[PDB]
Symmetry: D2
Subunit: 396 residues, 4 copies
């Protein structure tokens, strides 16, 4: 019995999971319990000093959460996993585990906004400095390293613009200089990109997105070597963020992840079609999509990703006002944040998430007035395309 | 329609809750969603800049979690609430919201061990110093204050020993010197003690314990003024710990809390009886219980608590080995950590949670070799007493 | 280890439940699985012929549902239990298990309306006849028996009017004449009335009401001898109604039932007060409540019930229109059906559930124009009373 | 806004669902409530007489269950839907709605065993007769019709052997003679076969199988004309079986069904490969699979099914003992009943479900000693094939 051995689809379905030993129940039971019962005083002391296995209390670990963690470790080719309340909590639990006052981080600039603020306004208040670079240009990463640099942090593709970061090249710079690479692998799952295999040390995910895939879990997951994971758990989560995952949330995300392979295939085949349509459209000025040949890092993309992903950005003819009109005129696509659910979602960070954010903040930070982000769900592409077509046509 | 007005039991049942407006559904629906849908671009921008109500995304807020938060705010007489993944996350989200490098905390020594470690080994790594005092002696609290002291932190009664801390007296010292009081109100719920009414600024709870009351939720809750809560939410939780609560966990804890008044009454009436039995027992050397007249702070207890609580500590004749035997000989009482569930739980932090923790660490830190902690559940007291009687008799 | 031995409160908390054997998890795990895994072909054949224990498939049985079933069997002093999708399904699964075409039932007239219709319009279509009697007059029960009478069916107290049925006296008539007694014990739980101890053969409950107690489960439970239960399960449920219970619903109802003893105590102490207030009110013409001395079967009530229950009926000065006004004027009490939740619920079967049901159907069937039914929740009685007082005053 | 209009994948994702109107919550909320609250007495009377919309009480209907019901109605091209506790309860609720004593049913012989027993031993006890025919030979269906025949009942493909039934041809015989056709569409979902479009009147499903697809829900669904559905609901379910569905079970099955299109595609592409491998294997004597050209009804299959399905039966060299060995020697495939989960499941109704069922009962009833049924999950086919190959090789 070793699940690391089977093909990747078999692993998505089976790894971390086994029928319940005392009943045969095939679905992983929801161990919705806060506490666990020891059968002896000495056994309670054994477990508590970390001297024996296994369970003590849900903040510390849980058999439902354990399966999910073993699964994701397997899919990412990591040694171990640690689930968390949110993807944000996967990132902060990681970096607050790795960092004390006086340390330095080097970060991609082109990351998720809530990650940006943690690093911008919160990290330095604990005396941990962060320097921001265009991670697409790995020399910038080298140029910002310092003796106190403990961690280099990246997302690929980069949330807003779908630019890429060469992981292997970034792995070697960070390592040469004594730092760990931490890669947020959220936009791809491990079905699409495996940063650990490229030399990264830690992978984090918002399991909220594709891994759960169903738009009803907020959660995160950390994957890395056993020694780091143990600290992330017994200190970072146990003591610092306390962002542990509900066993219900674990069990939903195990449910969600069974269909990861086939949902990724369909997300990505759908998005390719939609992107090609967007490219040919006279009212669309630019399309950002790793699967379009016109993508500046297309070849990089072809080597480190099995699939170009379910996310498309694009700019519409006429900026802010046209984008507003278009986003108000979709009938199928839903106006919401988050991504990686089975429904097609659309966001206009210009008329929307960044509207009373002064025009000059915006542009510096990769966002245009016409920029629309699409999360492509599992609908028939024709239906999405016709909805897009209608609303674009409406708006220009 | 104002629920702050009704009696305390009516509030436990009703406050924060109303039948679902589009259906009439009386149970608060589980909004197990990650995302929310805006009906306009401009409405999405309104909400996002904090310019209009209400929902955007579950890490930020959720209608299920909102009810629980409004309930607990009401019961504690606070302005607002913020739920969290764990009670630990309620504490760290609070103090990491209030503290940057260079700040000082003054803390009770006699607190929950995981809180102790956060303050001992983790807080100072962000350049935040913590000084530990016997909070039972409020002069010690005064004596340790500094110009950079931002927060005073206490538990009452104090987790291990059930010693008390005079909240009103501690409120005034902390305030006189420009600091906030933060009180962990976990061992009491607000049905028993309301620290905010005594002058505390922030109350935190592990809702895992009594508030949920059913041993199947890990969760926490923060209560305080709107201005602090907004920061705890939009920065501390959104950005730093990311310890948000599953809407399922919220909905269980709303379920759990309906019966808070009657479960507290029964916990406390049961525990009083058991404590009086323990007092009269020739093989029990000491009993720690706020409702026993021999309690050193009995009068303090009588003024700041409506009820003496569901927790008893006691020492058994013969130390470590007798306590081990006793704890291995109970048949009804369950050997487990946590407290405040409907089953009677018993822990022996000597033979157990602190066994390969060298004898000298232990004693300094209030723990004796014979010390047993009982969480008294909802069983018939006679049954618990006879189980206790049998096992004590076994062990000496 | 035998839970039939402890006091009744200890049993409510513990019976049917034990910590999970492979993990120690104290909360009963939710085995939300459809299927179970056998470790051998021969073991799969063993279980399937009923030749060995235990689990095969959730329609047939489940470890979560099993606990609830063992609990309720214990509390009712029955041999075994069988959970169901609804209380209606507990009744039909019972009687369709016990009855073929040509059989006869004798039933109380004063039962739940949906039960009435099953017996009125549905039972006879399968060639099973039902005769309706005032079960309050046990001679009427004797007078309607026939050689083909297989079952006598009753509710006590009787849903609408809170009249009672003498179980022991009805047990002996039914038995003398070769029939089983089936008692719907829903309005009481087993904490209040134990019909099996009085000589009844089968007890059914809508666990939707008090047993779950939290207004978020639809469910039912059957309790009786092992031999009948096995048929109810392997034929009646497996083959006929197929009304099996979700393991989630089981697990909520196990959660709900932990607090049964204390919720019943509070329901009943609250209702007593409210009933006495209603009695003294000049605008209330009649009050129906087993705990009022003016109850016609008060002594019967005193002998077969530990407590008079949480349900009050009463008539208001001025009939239909006054009752409508009153029910529209309550502010705390919620206008809804069902009963036995933690919120106080109020229904006016006159202006409401039976309004376009012609005035003459109604009166025959125990209902008056002014009749209001209150399900008394866990609010402060004073608050309920003042709400009642206000609205009554409004309405007359 | 009309979802009947979009392509079939768009419908799987969207139909029956819309963001929550008072919050925007994109996931359909779990309305885990027993009861609903009316805002007026008169509105409570309106709804109750069926005079206005909408909700009254979960046994009767629920907004979570409603979505699932509207979805499945849409996917099957029916007018309405009604969810149930089990697939068995979808069938009995249907036929007990349509049948009184004296009526006749004509049924396929080759159906699910639990359906068989209901019809064999239970239906006739209510004075409802059933005649069993080889539904593969539609003349046999004609030959058994009677003046009192109300319903013809079929499964296609037929659970054990995967024989087919020509729906259109059977529709016309049943209709010509004044009967309704009822088709159990469980082995296909509506993604694969739409019996209603072929002239059937009622479709039932065990949603336990493919529709939920995740092996953690027991549930069923009825689809048909509004007039029949209303009776199935307000009488058959409300009064007779009472097999209503938990809103949690509904919400899981809505979750499960989002991925129906892609899970069916993968189930069926996987199974085709495995079947072709099984065909070429010298130790496999017979393979039953609608997608193999050697299937006797291959052309029928090609016309009424979009896809040949995820189920394979086959016989192994050497009968009972070889099948036992093989089924005990699989390492990936799980030994369990049920089908249509994401894991590959295998059953040997010879050494197993029918072992102490005397050899002569068996053979009559289509089962051979060597017969193995495979439910093909979402693993890599190569992995399943190699596991099959190994175990077959083991066993012969
Ligand atoms: C790359 C990335 N990393 C982390 C997160 C944080 O995940 P949680 O919400 O679970 O804490 C997100 C969410 N980004 C939301 C999207 O841009 O709309 C993300 O896109
Ligand atoms: C007083 C107090 N505060 C905070 C916590 C932390 O709660 P969470 O486990 O939800 O993170 C605990 C738990 N103390 C466990 C008991 O001493 O066994 C506590 O007792
Ligand atoms: C006595 C009694 N028996 C059975 C039922 C049926 O229970 P389910 O709804 O779980 O199927 C009820 C519900 N009676 C609802 C009340 O009169 O408002 C009842 O009161
Ligand atoms: C065709 C068919 N119809 C109805 C059912 C009944 O479904 P429920 O278990 O939800 O009540 C089944 C289950 N048949 C199980 C399989 O043969 O292993 C079935 O295969």
């Amino acid at each position: 019995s070793d699940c690391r051995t089977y093909g990747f689809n078999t692993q998505i379905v089976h790894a971390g999971q086994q029928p319940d030993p005392s009943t045969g129940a095939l679905s992983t039971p929801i161990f919705q319990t806060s506490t666990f019962v020891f059968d002896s005083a000495e056994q309670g002391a054994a477990r508590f000093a970390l001297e024996e296995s296994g369970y003590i209390y849900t903040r510390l670990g849980n058999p439902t959460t354990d399966a999910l963690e073993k699964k994701l470790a397997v899919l990412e080719r990591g040694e171990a996993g640690l689930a968390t309340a949110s993807g944000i909590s996967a990132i902060t639990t990681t970096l607050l585990t790795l960092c004390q006052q006086g340390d330095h981080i080097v970060s991609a600039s082109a990351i998720y906004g809530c990650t940006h603020a943690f690093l911008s306004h919160s990290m330095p208040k604990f005396g941990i400095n962060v320097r921001f670079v265009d991670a697409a240009k790995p020399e910038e990463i080298r140029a910002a390293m310092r003796p106190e640099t403990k961690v280099v942090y990246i997302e690929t593709p980069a949330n807003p613009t779908l630019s890429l970061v060469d992981i292997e090249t970034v792995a070697g710079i960070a390592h040469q200089q004594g730092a760990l690479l931490v890669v947020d692998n959220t936009f791809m799952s491990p079905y699409c990109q495996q940063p650990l295999q490229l030399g990264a040390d830690i992978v984090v995910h918002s399991v909220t997105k594709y891994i759960n895939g169903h738009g009803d879990v907020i959660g995160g997951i950390i994957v890395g070597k056993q020694e780091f994971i143990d600290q992330a758990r017994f200190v970072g989560l146990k003591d610092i963020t306390g962002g542990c995952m509900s066993p219900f949330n674990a069990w939903l995300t195990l449910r969600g992840v069974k269909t990861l392979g086939i949902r990724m295939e369909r997300h990505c085949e759908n998005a390719l079609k939609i992107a090609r349509f967007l490219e040919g459209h006279p009212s669309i000025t630019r399309v950002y999509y790793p699967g379009l040949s016109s993508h500046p890092q297309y070849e990089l993309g072809q080597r480190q990703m099995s699939l170009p992903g379910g996310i498309i950005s694009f700019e519409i003819a006429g900026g802010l006002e046209a984008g507003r009109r278009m986003i108000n005129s979709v009938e199928l696509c839903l106006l919401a944040v988050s991504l990686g659910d089975t429904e097609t979602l659309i966001q206009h960070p210009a008329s929307m998430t960044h509207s009373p954010v002064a025009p000059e903040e915006r542009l510096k930070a990769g966002i245009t007035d016409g920029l629309i982000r699409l999360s492509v769900g599992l609908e028939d592409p024709e239906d999405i395309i016709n909805d897009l077509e209608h609303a674009i046509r409406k708006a220009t």
